[PDB]
């Protein structure tokens, strides 16, 4: 015999087990408990055992059977038997062949336990800013303390102490609570808190009574389990949930963005590519939101499970691990808010407010694994250029050693002892990389920033290098590691990604000092802009030790949020504009930078999967969300793949491409021009720039919805039940969401489709494009070819622009970050609208602009703030007769040359129904009016058309041209109309020409009939209106006009107007 081996955890892995683990791990009352043993080599003649005491009491040893043999070893099985509540149990392991040398493992020890429920409320004591229910248990002698507080009047604190010992944390005073023998109900003037005293049970309610969430109808629903004298080892509490409940976030999710039905795992953990079939993530979070109006968060870094409806289909419960410590208290949190991003608010509250990250973080970023030295540097910036890709992001990963991660690749140098940092002085630069300063230097002048690559571990995969092993020995020295529990250094397992390698204590300032020194060089004398920390998910083992005395369960969702914060503070610290970009992290992770989704493949499959990861993250505080688009592995994906792709990301948080290979033939980049040389689609270029531009044209609209995020806790991106959650066709939406807070986006995401459906919540949205208009409360179906996002702007909409001198969507306005070309406000006039715009070109300054519909008068006015620079309003009306500004009329320009040149003035676009208003800089607020306008026309050419088809070769239509002809029965345009303003009579104009002879058609109006008469015009050329009396009701009015058997004659249909 050369060993023996067992031990009880493992790696104490939450879904894989050791071959020597015992099972259960911890166990309870009633639980057969097994020891799976390994002996070495495979030999006759071996015997294992087990000696051990059972409440301080030797037993009779236990012999182990075997089990199989693998490789050089046998495994065996020991059968202790069931155990009571209570005992504990005292455990060696023992090897030995023929009487010889016993081999041995342990002591171990471990309680058994069964779970202890809350019974009733004995007594309540009120202390102004907490309350104490003192309660009895269902079994054991405890004497357990629930404590309420309010973190804010809307926000209710519960923090439970079994044992009774500890105290809970004051919070808010403006409660009042209504104490009787049966039941107390705490009240503020958000929520009215309902406890039943015997059984306790509690209901949760708004002011107004309407129930938030409740304790399960059985009662008896919060616990904790244990031996009752030496440990506390998890905590529960289970919730009544009717079956439409639906429930949100709970950090980055891959599979579905509503985990009714799941058994949700907070647990970090690195899942390369399967992330939706294995329903793993590398960014968890203890929190979720409810359609019902309200979020839980459970505030603990140990593992938790959350069984959404998955058992019992009215229940919901949360199983908290515990690391035994029998003072520490369960602390949950139950949210309410004005709304649902409220409640997300309220929730960064307590956890941290993301951070507002510069402009360029913004802009696109581009990356490939496989840039590895200075020409691969200076070709992507050569290719960036000659295809017009105005990028604000670059970013190296294959850039360095290999070894120390620090040091760039081919550089030579002295090597240094002590772990003492290095200066750029200190190397000899070499092949790969000859001059990185003036590598950096050179991305800057390009408009660009860029991050490297980190990890939060020192390598070492046994193989020898100076400088590495220089380190390793001073870390482990200066106790910079975390522990293995032993007093040796912490390593990650061997078979996982960096196996053997020792983590960086981040929970250790020291250690912390040390590990950045190394890379200080990189940002004061290099001049990087960031890093890239990737990595994270490798805390294993339940003794591993960290500086603040917290162990392995405690510390493995902590660890990459630490890690990821130390490197994002370091970095600021040294370079304000500096911006980190990770995969991992917990509760917190939004204080430190951007979050992208990982490792997926370059198929449909994997995008469906991406947004659902960004619409959970979204709703779970990570905001600034990014992911590889198009995919970053996997066969090239196809020219619509990347199209499709390429348009989501342009209307994502974070737009960026990348790919894994280090060195493929032919390039894996995910750029555009390597797509184009790769698919052999040229077309692949100018989409790509129809997005990018159309972002940076967005990038005022965009940025200040960032700082949103970060003062108010609004995700830039969100699913649609975050602002309907009362609506019942956005429960369970994913392929389409809110971007900013006025931009529907519903990205084209299954292959092969081109007919998408949108589902349109109440009132009227506006296609962004083209300036159709969709009434809303149904589903539309908008054609899309592969060229084609659906974007449509929610009625009332604001949006600040970018725009070039063409002054349409989708022109190159380039990346200068630090003043605008032509600052533009596109505005969707409904009812009274307010908006307040971040220039930050000028300092930050918050500009509020507000609007006034007044279409019933033929109006809209503009209450435009002091600004620094010139405007352009654009309008959505139809044309106007005169527009003020101060009173005073501003000059009508017929062109747009002439428009640009003017200094104020007018015009109108009439592809695009939009009035443009241009006024000059002042330190004062400026007074539009928009004189004898009506709400944009409804374009017959984007109506929903019958047997007939669209013209555009005879001038002065609106829009893109009009429906021709319309001259045979069965030919119908039906229009989707809204009432501008409630129900009531309105005239329809009918704009049309009729060229030959007088004709007429039938209108039908939600049902109604009438027949109208169209007069003959001098010819095609000319238009005439006619205006028809109707009578509209609230929402959509069906309003289709057909060709009957007593109608007459051809007509070109321009389109349709609604006024007063
Ligand atoms: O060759 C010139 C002529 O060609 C097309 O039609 C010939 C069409 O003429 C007479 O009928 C038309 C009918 O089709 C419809 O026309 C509307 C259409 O008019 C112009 O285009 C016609 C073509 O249809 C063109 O002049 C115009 O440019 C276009 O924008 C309009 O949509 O309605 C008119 C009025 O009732 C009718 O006169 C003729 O009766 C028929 O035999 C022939 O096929
Ligand atoms: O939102 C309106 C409309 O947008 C697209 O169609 C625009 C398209 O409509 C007609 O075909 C005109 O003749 C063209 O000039 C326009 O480009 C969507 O495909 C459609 O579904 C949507 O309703
Ligand atoms: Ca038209
Ligand atoms: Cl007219
Ligand atoms: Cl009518
Ligand atoms: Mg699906
Ligand atoms: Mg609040
Ligand atoms: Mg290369
Ligand atoms: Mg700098
Ligand atoms: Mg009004």
Redesign the pocket.
């Known amino acids: 015999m050369d060993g023996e081996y067992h031990s009880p955890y493992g790696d104490d892995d939450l879904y894989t087990v050791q071959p020597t683990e015992r099972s259960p791990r911890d166990p309870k009352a009633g639980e057969d408990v097994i020891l799976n043993i390994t002996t070495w080599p495979i030999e006759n003649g071996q015997d294992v055992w087990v000696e051990w005491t059972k409440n301080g009491v030797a037993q009779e040893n236990v012999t182990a059977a075997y089990d199989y043999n693998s490789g050089n070893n046998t495994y065996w099985k020991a059968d202790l038997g069931k155990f009571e509540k209570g005992d504990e149990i005292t455990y060696t392991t023992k090897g030995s062949t023929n009487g010889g040398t016993a081999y041995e493992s342990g002591p171990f020890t471990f309680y058994v336990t069964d779970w202890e429920y809350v019974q009733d409320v004995t007594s309540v004591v009120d202390n102004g800013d907490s309350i104490t229910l003192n309660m009895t248990a269902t079994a054991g002698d405890f004497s357990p303390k629930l404590y309420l507080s309010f973190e804010d009047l809307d926000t209710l604190r519960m923090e439970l102490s079994p044992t009774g010992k500890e105290t809970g944390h004051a919070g808010k005073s403006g409660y009042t609570v209504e104490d009787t023998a049966e039941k107390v109900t705490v009240t503020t003037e958000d929520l009215s808190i309902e406890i039943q005293k015997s059984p306790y049970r509690m209901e949760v309610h708004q002011a107004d009574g309407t129930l938030l969430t409740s304790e399960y109808t059985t009662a008896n629903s919060l616990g904790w389990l244990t031996d009752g004298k030496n440990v506390i080892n998890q905590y529960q509490n289970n919730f009544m949930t009717p079956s439409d409940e639906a429930f949100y976030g709970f950090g980055e999710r891959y599979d579905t963005i509503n985990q009714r039905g799941k058994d949700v795992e907070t647990y970090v953990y690195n899942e390369y590519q399967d992330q939706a079939q294995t329903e793993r993530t590398y960014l968890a979070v203890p929190f979720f939101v409810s359609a019902n109006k309200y979020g839980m968060y459970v505030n603990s870094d140990f593992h938790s499970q959350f069984q959404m409806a998955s058992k019992v289909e009215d229940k919901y419960s949360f199983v908290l691990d515990n690391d035994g410590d029998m003072t520490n208290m369960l602390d949950y949190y139950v949210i309410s808010g004005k709304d649902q991003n409220d409640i997300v608010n309220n929730y960064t509250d307590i956890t941290g407010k993301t951070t507002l990250l510069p402009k360029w973080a913004f802009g696109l970023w581009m990356s490939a694994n496989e840039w590895d030295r200075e020409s691969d540097v200076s070709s992507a910036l050569s290719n960036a250029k000659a295809n017009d890709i105005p990028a604000t992001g670059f970013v190296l990963e294959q850039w360095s050693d290999e070894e120390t991660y620090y040091i760039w690749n081919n550089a030579t140098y002295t090597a240094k002892k002590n772990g003492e940092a290095f200066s750029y002085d200190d190397f000899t630069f070499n092949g790969k990389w000859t001059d990185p300063k003036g590598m950096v230097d050179s991305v800057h002048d390009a408009g660009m920033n860029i991050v490297l690559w980190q990890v939060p571990v020192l390598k070492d995969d046994g193989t020898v290098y100076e400088q590495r092993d220089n380190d390793e020995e001073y870390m482990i020295s200066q106790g910079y590691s975390a522990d293995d529990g032993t007093g040796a250094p912490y390593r990650v397992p061997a078979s996982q990604w960096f196996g053997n390698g020792i983590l960086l204590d981040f929970t250790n300032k020291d250690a912390v000092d040390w590990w950045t020194s190394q890379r200080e060089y990189l940002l004061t004398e290099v001049g990087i802009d960031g890093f890239k920390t990737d990595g994270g998910e490798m805390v294993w083992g339940r003794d591993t030790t960290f500086s603040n005395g917290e162990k392995g369960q405690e510390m493995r969702n902590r660890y990459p949020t630490d890690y990821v914060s130390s490197y994002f503070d370091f970095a600021k610290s040294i370079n304000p504009e500096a911006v980190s970009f990770s995969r991992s992290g917990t509760s917190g992770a939004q204080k430190s930078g951007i979050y992208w989704s990982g490792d997926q493949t370059s198929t449909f499959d994997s995008f469906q999967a991406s947004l659902k990861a960004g619409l959970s993250a979204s709703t779970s505080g990570v905001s600034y969300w990014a992911w590889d688009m198009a995919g970053f592995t996997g066969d090239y994906p196809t020219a619509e793949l990347y199209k499709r792709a390429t348009a989501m990301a342009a209307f994502a948080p974070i737009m960026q491409f990348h790919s894994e290979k280090s060195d493929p033939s032919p390039s894996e980049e995910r750029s555009p021009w390597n797509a184009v040389a790769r698919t052999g689609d040229e077309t692949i270029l100018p989409t790509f720039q129809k997005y990018l531009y159309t972002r940076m044209n967005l990038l005022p609209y965009i940025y200040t919805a960032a700082k949103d995020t970060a003062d108010n806790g609004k995700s830039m991106m969100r699913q649609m039940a975050m602002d309907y959650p009362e609506d019942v066709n956005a429960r369970d939406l994913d392929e389409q969401y809110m971007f900013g807070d006025d931009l529907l986006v519903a990205p084209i995401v299954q292959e092969g489709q081109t007919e998408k459906e949108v589902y349109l919540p109440e009132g009227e949205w506006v296609d962004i494009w083209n300036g159709g208009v969709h009434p809303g409360g149904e589903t539309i179906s908008y054609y899309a070819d592969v060229d084609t996002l659906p974007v449509f702007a929610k009625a009332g909409a604001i949006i600040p622009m970018n725009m070039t001198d063409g002054y349409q969507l989708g022109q190159n306005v380039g990346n200068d970050l630090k003043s605008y070309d032509n600052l533009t406000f596109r505005v969707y006039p409904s009812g009274d609208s307010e908006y307040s715009f971040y220039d930050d070109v000028n300092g930050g300054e918050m500009r509020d602009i507000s609007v006034s519909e007044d279409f019933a008068n033929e109006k809209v006015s503009v209450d435009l703030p002091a600004m620094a620079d010139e405007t352009t309003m654009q309008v959505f009306s139809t044309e106007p007769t005169s527009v003020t500004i101060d009173g005073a009329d501003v000059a009508k320009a017929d062109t747009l040359d002439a428009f640009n040149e003017a200094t104020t003035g007018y015009y109108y676009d009439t592809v695009q129904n939009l009035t443009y208003v241009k006024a000059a800089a002042k330190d004062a607020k400026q007074a539009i009016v928009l004189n004898g306008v009506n709400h944009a026309p409804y374009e017959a050419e984007f109506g929903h058309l019958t047997n007939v088809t669209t013209?555009s070769?005879?001038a002065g239509y609106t829009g893109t041209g009009f429906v021709?002809?319309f001259?045979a029965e069965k030919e119908a345009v039906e229009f989707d109309i809204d009432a501008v303003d409630g129900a009531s009579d309105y005239t329809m104009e009918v704009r049309y020409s009729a060229?030959?002879?007088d004709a007429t058609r039938t209108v039908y109006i939600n049902g109604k009939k009438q027949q109208i008469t169209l007069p003959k015009t001098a010819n095609?050329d000319t238009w005439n209106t006619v205006e028809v009396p109707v009578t509209l009701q609230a929402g959509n009015n069906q309003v289709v006009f057909d060709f009957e058997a007593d109608d007459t004659?051809?007509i070109?249909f321009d389109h349709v107007v609604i006024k007063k």
């Open positions: 013209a070769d005879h021709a002809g001259d060229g030959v002879e095609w004659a051809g070109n």
